[PDB]
From Swiss-Prot, chain A:
GO terms for cellular component: mitochondrial inner membrane; mitochondrion; proton-transporting ATP synthase complex. F-type ATPases have 2 components, CF(1) - the catalytic core - and CF(0) - the membrane proton channel. In yeast, the dimeric form of ATP synthase consists of 17 polypeptides: alpha, beta, gamma, delta, epsilon, 4 (B), 5 (OSCP), 6 (A), 8, 9 (C), d, E (Tim11), f, g, h, i/j and k. This is ATP synthase subunit f, mitochondrial. Present with 14600 molecules/cell in log phase SD medium. Belongs to the ATPase F chain family. The chain holds residues 7 to 91 of 101 of the full protein. It is found in: Mitochondrion; Mitochondrion inner membrane. Mitochondrial membrane ATP synthase (F(1)F(0) ATP synthase or Complex V) produces ATP from ADP in the presence of a proton gradient across the membrane which is generated by electron transport complexes of the respiratory chain. F-type ATPases consist of two structural domains, F(1) - containing the extramembraneous catalytic core and F(0) - containing the membrane proton channel, linked together by a central stalk and a peripheral stalk. During catalysis, ATP synthesis in the catalytic domain of F(1) is coupled via a rotary mechanism of the central stalk subunits to proton translocation. Keywords: ATP synthesis, CF(0), Hydrogen ion transport, Ion transport, Membrane, Mitochondrion, Mitochondrion inner membrane, Transit peptide, Transport.
From Swiss-Prot, chain B:
It comes from Saccharomyces cerevisiae (strain ATCC 204508 / S288c) (Baker's yeast). Mitochondrial membrane ATP synthase (F(1)F(0) ATP synthase or Complex V) produces ATP from ADP in the presence of a proton gradient across the membrane which is generated by electron transport complexes of the respiratory chain. F-type ATPases consist of two structural domains, F(1) - containing the extramembraneous catalytic core, and F(0) - containing the membrane proton channel, linked together by a central stalk and a peripheral stalk. During catalysis, ATP synthesis in the catalytic domain of F(1) is coupled via a rotary mechanism of the central stalk subunits to proton translocation. Belongs to the ATPase d subunit family. Present with 6820 molecules/cell in log phase SD medium. This is ATP synthase subunit d, mitochondrial. F-type ATPases have 2 components, CF(1) - the catalytic core - and CF(0) - the membrane proton channel. In yeast, the dimeric form of ATP synthase consists of 17 polypeptides: alpha, beta, gamma, delta, epsilon, 4 (B), 5 (OSCP), 6 (A), 8, 9 (C), d, E (Tim11), f, g, h, i/j and k. It is found in: Mitochondrion; Mitochondrion inner membrane.
Length: 85, 58
């Protein structure tokens, strides 16, 4: 006798699958993400975004700003030594 | 019939067979039920097809 009609309705393998939850997530997350960004280091732009670019990028952990800032404090109280002299 | 020597009863059953030579006439009944079944089946089949095709491109 005639083969039954349950297989001709699908709406329980289309909404009844687990990656649907991931699908609706990653259509929003990925589709709505700019493939590229603006600029990594730019804070303090006044030729001191350049200071950030040379020293406070994630492209270096080089000791130069530390040295520079340290030397600043040496310059601060030392000048004041000759101001207090 | 040529075996039987009492033949006039083989002529009888010959005539009974040829009388009742229609032993039952035509049956086509799948022409009302098959079409009804086909409408619902087609509808559901196309619905599923369109839904999943849409989802594939999605």
């Amino acid at each position: 006798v005639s083969t039954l009609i349950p297989p001709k309705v699908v709406s329980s393998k289309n909404i009844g699958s687990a990656p649907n939850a991931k699908r609706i997530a990653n259509v929003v997350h990925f589709y709505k993400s700019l493939p590229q960004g603006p600029a990594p280091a730019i804070k303090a732009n006044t030729r001191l975004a350049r200071y950030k670019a040379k020293y406070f990028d994630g492209d270096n952990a080089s000791g130069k700003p530390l040295w520079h800032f340290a030397l600043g404090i040496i310059a601060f109280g030392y000048s004041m030594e000759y101001y207090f002299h | 019939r040529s075996v039987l020597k009492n033949t006039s009863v083989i002529d009888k059953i010959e005539s009974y067979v040829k009388q009742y030579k229609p032993v039952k006439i035509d049956a086509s009944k799948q022409l009302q039920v098959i079409e009804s079944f086909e409408k619902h089946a087609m509808t559901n089949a196309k619905e599923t097809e369109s839904l999943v095709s849409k989802e594939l491109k999605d």
